[PDB]
């Protein structure tokens, strides 16, 4: 009922550990490649945020950051 | 206490902070789900920093005109606060010992040392007292509050021996700082509207208030 | 307890009153390191003695020689006979050699206490040297140290501090007005409302440079006034 | 740095760097040797 | 404990103060790996030594140029030497590349296999190429005075002095390049211009460094 | 060139904002579901303040510079924008209403500003595009309309509306319950909001194409 | 400007809008309206603490000031638009 600024501090840590692990966002692609189809899947489910997890808060936060990156590209 | 108080802002404003009048209709000090820069410690620290900077600014913006009108300083000086080289389009003073960019580089180095050490003490309380700084680290320890560091230099005369006296002085500082901030905003607005100095506006308004105000200065 | 410099302030823990003239004044905390404190005490003693000598020299020079400016007294054309128009290079060589020798001896005394008291040429000629910066012996032939040395050292350091302030006042007075302290005092007494720091400031009587014989020495005032 | 090097060792980054190097070499070759049609 | 490049900031794990001139300055973590840090240590030492030689030569030549000796500036010495003396520029480049190639190749393969150059395959010399530490090649040829084989504390102090002087010389060479590209004269000419008028002759008045001035 | 440097700075700021909001201060789900406050801000602040700021730039820079360009003045001899923004003499010469300051605005004498806020219509016979005075007046009206619309929904005070209340109040005999549950659908599904936004956005883009060939707003565009 | 029709109309408009909300005749921060335009209690998140006998807070003053300004500006421009 109150409109305020709700926030969480340091939810995700800034690191390059996940950059070396392709397909970490999805549970199906986290295993690794076995066939070439997987590679295509890696690009088809990249922005599919409601498929990585069922938490609406995580999806909204990812959407917000995606919007900022898009505006940076436009600038 | 003041106008605009609310039951929601009173949940986190219990008079602990200095100058707490319960004026927070925008809810910026709510500790529930707080982060980044919108949090009580940083906000109070920023307010006291703006308070002190605005106090020096208001005094420095109204001092040369008052001293010039009193005949204490010569005619070469006594210029408007926005005509002293601050904004070259509004006017610049060439009587300095060097161009404003050289003095700006000096200010860059000086302000970087002061502000960066201040920030490092805020991020880590007491970390400015261990590393060697020509023996000056003995007075850069501060305290638990980054807004009120103290020590042999920042508290030269050791004022506020009693907790009540320190609280009274803190409230006086925050109130004078808020008044100075409003005065600085008024200085900028009057400079943009009237195009003259603040003391000149005060004199013109004191001569004939009915014909000298914001309503008559529109056109 | 001793009287502090400010009413209500608390003196530092490293300033208990052992040294002379200890008012518990150290806003920068430069005395936290004991080695640095001893070095600064020697530096303050040197500054105090040199300032007292300079202040007394300026005053006596203005009294005995009222027509010679103490600021421009360093020029070779203002030196008295038989040192007029003398080569400043040899003069600098003399001062450098003698001052270098005595200052190296004093520095060695600071680094290693009681290690250079003996005369290196004539054995047996030593100085007592009770504390650092207080050699005595040949330096104090009248023997005034065989008594209350605490109050005497306190008077020495206080007079030296006052002389330091006085000599800097002399320098700024000569830089803003262009005359000696006695002449400036007489000028101020002639008209206090006309000759003060309110009007004399902003003017730097010191020129941009001086040509001492062949080379040019750059000169400046302590503040960016009008040259 | 190990993770950063592993990321730079992935197929798209390696492909980008390799094709940039090959394209640059071919472009510089045609620049210093304009219009080569025969040997 | 030890001083750092940014007071209050904890030093990184890959910088524990064992190396000379260690101030914990690595915001990009370029030397987090041990082998990479070893390679970067040798690179920094070589850079500082070359920068020291360059700064000393440039300062001495500019000193001779300011006085009436006819010394050319550092940005024209190559042309003056090649045109004054009948010296072929590509021949000199090839000779320099041959000597530097031999020296740097021996140093590189010594970095890959420490102590390998001491096998005696190069004219029978063994202890002259055994090497002391990484980037510190002790021996009778590189250190004939034997300062690296005596008084360990003095050796560590000299190591700290060497790394600090090398970093200062690198900054000095960068300043030489910027000063020549912005003012057009030599470093001592800029120093004389600044000493003649420090309030009006600086980087804030050259008209190139600050474009909005 | 300065605008390019500013754009690069803004790009770095946008990237830093994304990193900060994902790894340093990530808002909760309740912050994203404040559609009333979000709409109030996007209507008043974003659209209204953007239109007002552009109106100010058009009145103080586009109007005098373009008027001088259409008057035959060489581009090098035209005064700089800050020169026009610093003194009232040049602006008063190009537009006499500027000699009165902001006084006619507060005295409800807006008719005095009839030299740079008109309804000329048609196109400029010299450049071929729309009159910039009309576009400036347009942006002023648009800013006032959006700023007024930005105070419609309730946020933290009693005044304002609740979109759920308005949706539930709209129900007729031929539709059953009506818009019940639509508020919960749009406040919890990003795909539904994306569908609505993409449809209206694409429609507005096509409308932009038609309005731009029909009414050319830029000089020498037609 | 003081005493002119523009000033009188604007002052009367602002005073009329301020008098209606305080005397329970216009929507306030404490009393909302239904679809049949009937006053009823609200659920304000702020809950501004006011000393007024009817609970007239500063938010009501700002809202009524804006409403009166809009009505006054429209009335003045409308009369100036019809030549009256
Ligand atoms: C999609 C845009 C957007 C949105 C919705 C938000 C929203 C939020 N930000 Mg954020 N931010 C953004 C973009 C955005 N930001 C960008 C682009 C940057 C990089 C500059 C930042 C950097 C940033 C930081 C560092 C922080 C936030 C914080 C916050 C939170 C509360 C503070 C606040 O913004 O309240 C109100 C805003 C203010 C009180 C300050 C605004 C003053 C600006 C500088 C005025 C100038 C900008 C203006 C639009 C230009 C007008 C022109 C002018 C010259 C006339 C809030 C949820 C804080 C947080 O994490 O809280 C939890 C926080 O610390 N933001
Ligand atoms: C406290 C702030 C303050 C500041 C920032 C300045 C700054 C300045 N003053 Mg000044 N002055 C001040 C106070 C101040 N004054 C007061 C209170 C008096 C009355 C005694 C004077 C009387 C004065 C005179 C007579 C002159 C200046 C002049 C100048 C300018 C040249 C700098 C200089 O070396 O001259 C002088 C340096 C000082 C006076 C030191 C001021 C230190 C104050 C007292 C600290 C407190 C300079 C921009 C000169 C000028 O007008 O430019 C052409 C000049 O002729 N001032
Ligand atoms: C399979 C089709 C095909 C073939 C056989 C060629 C063949 C050739 N093209 Mg061509 N081209 C093609 C497709 C093809 N092209 C397509 C699809 C396009 C459109 C993108 C172009 C657009 C194009 C342009 C714009 C140009 C050429 C040029 C050339 C000639 C350059 C020879 C060279 O690079 O120097 C020699 C290459 C080397 C020495 C590299 C050697 C590799 C290593 C370093 C050494 C190993 C050797 C043992 C060459 C005979 C250039 C030309 O001048 O035409 C005469 C030129 O300007 N092509
Ligand atoms: C250098 C700073 C930095 C670092 C170390 C990280 C690190 C991390 N981020 Mg993060 N982030 C950053 C900045 C950073 N981020 C910024 C600036 C933004 C705003 C855009 C975000 C927004 C963000 C989100 C929303 C998420 C992460 C996630 C993650 C984690 C894994 C994803 C990943 O990195 O794969 C590497 C990914 C890439 C290399 C793709 C980058 C593409 C960029 C953004 C746009 C490229 C545009 C391109 C040029 C245009 C295409 C045209 C084409 C022809 C070239 C990881 C630990 C994810 C996570 O935590 O998992 C749950 C998560 O969902 N980040
Ligand atoms: C007057 C306040 C205000 C303003 C101006 C904006 C502006 C914007 N919002 Mg935001 N928002 C606001 C309030 C505001 N919001 C509030 C109160 C909430 C919480 C209910 C949100 C929640 C929200 C979400 C969830 C999202 C936005 C998004 C956006 C951007 C849409 C991109 C676009 O097409 O526009 C035009 C683009 C530009 C004009 C680019 C220039 C950007 C400048 C700097 C304006 C930024 C102003 C903003 C208030 C940040 C300043 C705060 C300070 C801390 C930096 C846009 C810049 C989207 C986004 O995240 O984009 C990144 C988005 O997903 N907003
Ligand atoms: C958002 C849009 C916008 C903006 C930014 C401006 C801005 C400006 N307009 Mg303008 N205008 C606009 C829209 C806008 N206008 C529209 C839509 C119209 C049509 C109705 C007009 C019609 C108009 C006219 C007729 C005139 C102006 C004028 C002006 C200038 C002076 C304003 C004034 O009269 O004093 C107002 C006083 C203020 C705005 C106060 C300023 C507050 C300052 C910034 C505070 C700074 C304080 C700070 C803390 C200081 C500390 C700094 C520290 C370093 C010491 C000014 C730069 C005048 C002009 O340019 O003369 C030629 C003029 O006569 N405008
Ligand atoms: C004393 C009461 C009063 C009077 C006599 C007027 C009189 C007038 N108003 Mg006005 N107005 C008033 C109050 C009043 N208004 C109030 C309280 C507001 C709200 C703040 C407005 C807001 C308003 C706006 C926004 C506009 C007018 C306009 C007009 C003029 C248009 C005549 C017409 O028939 O419209 C036109 C008839 C139509 C059929 C057009 C409607 C087309 C739609 C889309 C269908 C007219 C002289 C217009 C104007 O600016 O004058 C030139 C206009 O744009 N008024
Ligand atoms: C057009 C007539 C709109 C029809 C219209 O909206 O009338 C109005 C009628 C009344 O609906 P309600 O009053 O119950 O709606 C109230 C709530 O929906 C909220 O307003 O709506 C319908 O009839 C829905 C049935 C579709 C009607 C089918 C008619 C098909 C014609 C469409 C072809 C277009 C050409
Ligand atoms: C309370 C509240 C609560 C809720 O809830 C929320 C809200 C609403 C947000 C709120 C409010 C707030 C506010 C009011 C704010 C404001 C502020 C200001 C004004 C500041 C200023 C501020 C100001 C400032 C800093 C200023 C400063 C200044 C200065 C330095 C100056 C300087 C100078 C001088 C000396 C003189 C010369 O000639 C010039 C110069 C050189 C330049
Ligand atoms: C008797 C009494 C009293 C008094 C009270 C008062 C007097 C109040 C008031 C108040 C007021 C007197 C207020 C005012 C206000 C205002 C406002 C709030 C405004 C505004 C604005 C706006 C928003 C506008 C807008 C616009 C524009 C800008 C343009 C276009 C058009 C329009 C309109 C849209 C007391 C309590 C003391 C005591 C008891 C009783
Ligand atoms: C008149 C010819 C004099 C020699 C001219 C140069 C020849 C160069 C040969 C240098 C000999 C290098 C190796 C010397 C000694 C080796 O360490 C031992 N033979 C290995 O047992
Ligand atoms: C103008 C350029 C002349 C260069 C003269 C080449 C002299 C030979 C130097 C080649 C060194 C190659 C080192 C081996 C490669 C490696 O260590 O990985
Ligand atoms: C654009 C808004 C149009 C509003 C139409 C209102 C019609 C009144 C219907 C009231 C029905 C009721 O409250 O019983």
UniProtKB/Swiss-Prot annotation, chain A:
Localization in the cell: Plastid, Chloroplast thylakoid membrane
Highest taxon listed in the record's lineage: Eukaryota
Function: PsaA and PsaB bind P700, the primary electron donor of photosystem I (PSI), as well as the electron acceptors A0, A1 and FX. PSI is a plastocyanin/cytochrome c6-ferredoxin oxidoreductase, converting photonic excitation into a charge separation, which transfers an electron from the donor P700 chlorophyll pair to the spectroscopically characterized acceptors A0, A1, FX, FA and FB in turn. Oxidized P700 is reduced on the lumenal side of the thylakoid membrane by plastocyanin or cytochrome c6.
Subunit structure, as described in the record: The PsaA/B heterodimer binds the P700 chlorophyll special pair and subsequent electron acceptors. PSI consists of a core antenna complex that captures photons, and an electron transfer chain that converts photonic excitation into a charge separation. The eukaryotic PSI reaction center is composed of at least 11 subunits.
Family label: Belongs to the PsaA/PsaB family.
UniProt-recorded name of the protein: Photosystem I P700 chlorophyll a apoprotein A1
Part of the full-length chain shown: 11 to 85 of 751
Curated annotation (Swiss-Prot), chain D:
Record-level GO cellular component terms: chloroplast thylakoid membrane; photosystem I
Gene Ontology biological process: photosynthesis
Transmembrane segments: 7-27
Native organism: Chlamydomonas reinhardtii (Chlamydomonas smithii)
InterPro entries: PSI_PsaJ, PSI_PsaJ_sf
Major subcellular site: plastid
Protein name: Photosystem I reaction center subunit IX
Membrane topology term: Single-pass membrane protein
Keywords carried by this UniProt record: Chloroplast, Membrane, Photosynthesis, Photosystem I, Plastid, Thylakoid, Transmembrane, Transmembrane helix
Tagged with keyword Lyase: no
Gene, per the UniProt record: psaJ
Family label: Belongs to the PsaJ family.
PANTHER family named in the record: PHOTOSYSTEM I REACTION CENTER SUBUNIT IX, PTHR36082
Function: May help in the organization of the PsaE and PsaF subunits.
Xref: Gene3D superfamilies: Single helix bin (1.20.5.510)
Subcellular localization(s) per the UniProt record: Plastid, Chloroplast thylakoid membrane
Source taxonomy: Eukaryota, Viridiplantae, Chlorophyta, core chlorophytes, Chlorophyceae
Swiss-Prot record, chain F:
Localization: Plastid, Chloroplast thylakoid membrane
Entry's transmembrane regions: 1-23, 39-63, 135-153, 190-213
Function: PsaA and PsaB bind P700, the primary electron donor of photosystem I (PSI), as well as the electron acceptors A0, A1 and FX. PSI is a plastocyanin/cytochrome c6-ferredoxin oxidoreductase, converting photonic excitation into a charge separation, which transfers an electron from the donor P700 chlorophyll pair to the spectroscopically characterized acceptors A0, A1, FX, FA and FB in turn. Oxidized P700 is reduced on the lumenal side of the thylakoid membrane by plastocyanin or cytochrome c6.
Family label: Belongs to the PsaA/PsaB family.
Subunit field text: The PsaA/B heterodimer binds the P700 chlorophyll special pair and subsequent electron acceptors. PSI consists of a core antenna complex that captures photons, and an electron transfer chain that converts photonic excitation into a charge separation. The eukaryotic PSI reaction center is composed of at least 11 subunits.
Protein name: Photosystem I P700 chlorophyll a apoprotein A1
Organism: Chlamydomonas reinhardtii
UniProtKB/Swiss-Prot annotation, chain G:
Keyword Ribosomal protein attributed: no
Membrane topology, from the record: Multi-pass membrane protein
Principal location: plastid
The protein's name in its UniProt record: Photosystem I reaction center subunit psaK, chloroplastic
Subcellular location: Plastid, Chloroplast thylakoid membrane
Lineage per the UniProt record: Eukaryota, Viridiplantae, Chlorophyta, core chlorophytes, Chlorophyceae
GO biological process: photosynthesis
Record GO cellular component, one term: photosystem I
Coiled coil: none
Covered range of the whole protein: 29 to 112 of 113
TM segment ranges: 1-21, 58-79
Record family assignment: Belongs to the PsaG/PsaK family.
Keywords assigned: Chloroplast, Membrane, Photosynthesis, Photosystem I, Plastid, Thylakoid, Transit peptide, Transmembrane, Transmembrane helix
């Amino acid at each position: 009922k109150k409109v305020k600024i709700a926030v969480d501090r340091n939810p995700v840590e800034t690191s390059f550990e996940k950059w070396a692990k392709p397909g970490h966002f999805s549970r199906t692609l986290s295993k690794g490649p076995n066939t070439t189809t997987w590679i295509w899947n890696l690009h088809a489910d990249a922005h599919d945020f409601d498929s990585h997890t069922s938490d609406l808060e995580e999806i909204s936060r990812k959407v917000f950051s995606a919007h900022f990156g898009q505006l940076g590209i436009i600038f | 206490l003041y106008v605009g108080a609310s039951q929601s802002s009173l949940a986190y404003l219990d008079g602990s902070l200095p100058g707490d009048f319960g004026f927070d209709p925008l809810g910026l000090l709510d500790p529930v789900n707080s982060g980044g820069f919108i949090e009580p410690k940083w906000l109070q620290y920023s307010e006291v920093i703006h308070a002190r900077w605005a106090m020096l600014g208001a005094a420095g913006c109204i001092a040369p005109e008052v001293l010039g009108a009193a005949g204490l300083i010569p005619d070469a000086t006594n210029i408007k606060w926005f005509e002293s080289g601050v904004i070259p389009p509004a006017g610049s003073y060439n009587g300095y010992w060097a161009d404003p960019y050289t003095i700006f580089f000096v200010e860059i180095v000086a302000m970087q040392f002061a502000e960066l050490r201040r920030l490092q003490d805020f991020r880590y309380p007491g970390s400015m007292g261990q590393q060697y700084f020509l023996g000056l680290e003995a007075i850069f320890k501060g305290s638990g509050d980054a807004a009120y560091p103290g020590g042999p230099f920042f508290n030269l005369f050791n004022l506020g021996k009693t907790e009540a006296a320190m609280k009274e002085l803190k409230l006086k500082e925050i109130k004078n700082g808020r008044l100075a901030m409003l005065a600085m905003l008024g200085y900028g607005a009057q400079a943009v509207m009237t195009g003259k100095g603040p003391f000149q506006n005060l004199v013109e308004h004191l001569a004939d208030p009915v014909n000298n105000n914001i309503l008559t200065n529109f056109g | 307890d001793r009287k502090l410099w400010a009413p209500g302030v608390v003196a530092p823990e490293y300033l208990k009153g052992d040294l002379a003239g200890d008012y518990g004044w150290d806003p920068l905390g430069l005395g936290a390191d004991p080695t640095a404190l001893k070095w600064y005490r020697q530096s303050e003693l040197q500054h105090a003695r040199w300032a007292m000598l300079g202040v007394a020299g300026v005053l006596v020079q203005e009294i005995v020689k009222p027509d010679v400016y103490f600021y421009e007294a360093g020029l070779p054309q203002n030196l008295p006979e038989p040192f007029t128009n003398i080569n400043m290079g040899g003069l600098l060589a003399w001062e450098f050699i003698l001052m270098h020798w005595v200052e190296v001896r004093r520095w060695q005394d600071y680094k290693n206490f009681g290690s250079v008291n003996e005369d290196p040429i004539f054995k047996g000629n030593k100085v007592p040297n009770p504390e650092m910066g207080y050699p005595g012996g040949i330096f104090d032939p009248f023997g005034f140290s065989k008594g209350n040395l605490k109050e005497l050292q306190t008077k020495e350091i206080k007079n030296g501090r006052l002389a330091m302030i006085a000599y800097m006042a002399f320098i700024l007075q000569a830089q803003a007005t262009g005359k000696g302290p006695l002449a400036a005092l007489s000028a101020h007494l002639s008209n206090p409302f006309g000759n003060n720091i309110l009007k004399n400031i902003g003017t730097c009587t010191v020129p941009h440079s001086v040509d001492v014989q062949g080379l040019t020495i750059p000169l400046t005032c302590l503040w960016p006034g009008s040259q | 740095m190990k993770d950063f090097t592993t990321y730079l060792s992935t197929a798209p980054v390696i492909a980008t760097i390799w094709f940039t190097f090959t394209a640059g070499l071919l472009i510089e070759i045609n620049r210093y040797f304009p219009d080569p049609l025969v040997f | 404990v030890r001083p750092v490049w940014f007071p209050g900031n904890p030093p990184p794990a890959h910088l524990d103060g064992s190396l000379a001139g260690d101030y914990g300055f690595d915001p990009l973590f370029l030397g987090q790996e041990p082998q990479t840090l070893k390679w970067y240590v040798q690179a920094e030492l070589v850079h500082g030594r070359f920068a020291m030689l360059g700064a000393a030569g440039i300062i001495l030549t500019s000193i001779g140029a300011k006085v009436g000796l006819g010394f050319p500036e550092w940005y024209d010495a190559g042309k003056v030497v090649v045109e004054k003396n009948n010296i072929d520029f590509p021949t000199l480049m090839v000779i320099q590349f041959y000597l530097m190639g031999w020296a740097e190749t021996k140093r590189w393969y010594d970095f890959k296999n420490p102590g390998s150059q001491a096998d005696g395959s190069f004219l029978g010399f063994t202890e002259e190429f055994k090497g002391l530490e990484n980037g510190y090649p002790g021996g009778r040829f590189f250190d004939p005075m034997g300062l690296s084989r005596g008084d360990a504390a003095k050796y560590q102090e000299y190591k700290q002095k060497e790394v600090k002087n090398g970093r200062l010389a690198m900054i000095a060479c960068l300043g030489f390049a910027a000063q020549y590209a912005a003012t057009g004269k030599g470093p001592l000419d800029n120093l004389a211009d600044h000493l003649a008028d420090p309030n009006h002759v600086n980087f804030a008045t050259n008209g190139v460094s600050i474009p909005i001035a | 060139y300065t605008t390019a440097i500013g754009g690069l700075v803004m790009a770095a700021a946008m990237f830093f904002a994304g990193w900060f909001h994902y790894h340093k201060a990530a808002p909760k789900l309740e912050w994203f579901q404040n559609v009333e406050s979000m709409l109030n801000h996007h209507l008043g602040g974003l659209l209204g303040l953007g239109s007002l700021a552009w109106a100010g730039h058009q009145i103080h820079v586009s109007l005098p510079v373009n008027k001088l360009l259409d008057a035959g003045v060489d581009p090098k001899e035209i005064p700089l924008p800050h020169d026009l923004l610093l003194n009232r003499a040049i602006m008063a010469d190009l537009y006499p209403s500027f000699a009165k300051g902001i006084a006619p605005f507060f005295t409800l004498n807006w008719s005095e500003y009839s030299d740079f806020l008109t309804f000329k219509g048609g196109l400029n016979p010299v450049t071929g595009g729309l009159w910039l005075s009309d576009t400036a007046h347009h942006h002023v009206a648009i800013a006032v309309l959006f700023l007024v619309a930005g105070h419609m929904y309730r946020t933290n005070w009693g005044i304002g509306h609740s979109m759920k209340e308005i949706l539930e109040a709209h129900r007729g005999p031929f539709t059953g319950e009506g818009h019940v549950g639509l508020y919960e659908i749009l406040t919890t599904s990003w795909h539904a909001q994306l569908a609505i936004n993409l449809a209206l956005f694409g429609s507005l883009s096509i409308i932009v194409a038609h309005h731009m060939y029909a009414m050319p707003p830029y000089p020498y565009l037609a | 400007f003081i005493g002119s029709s523009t000033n009188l109309i604007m002052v009367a408009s602002t005073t009329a809008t301020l008098a209606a909300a305080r005397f329970g005749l216009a929507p306030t921060v404490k009393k909302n309206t239904t679809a049949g335009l009937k006053l009823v209690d609200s659920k304000n998140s702020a809950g501004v603490i006011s000393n007024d006998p009817a609970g007239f807070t500063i938010v009501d003053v700002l809202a009524m000031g804006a409403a009166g300004h809009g009505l006054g500006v429209g009335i003045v421009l409308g009369l100036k638009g019809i030549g009256a």
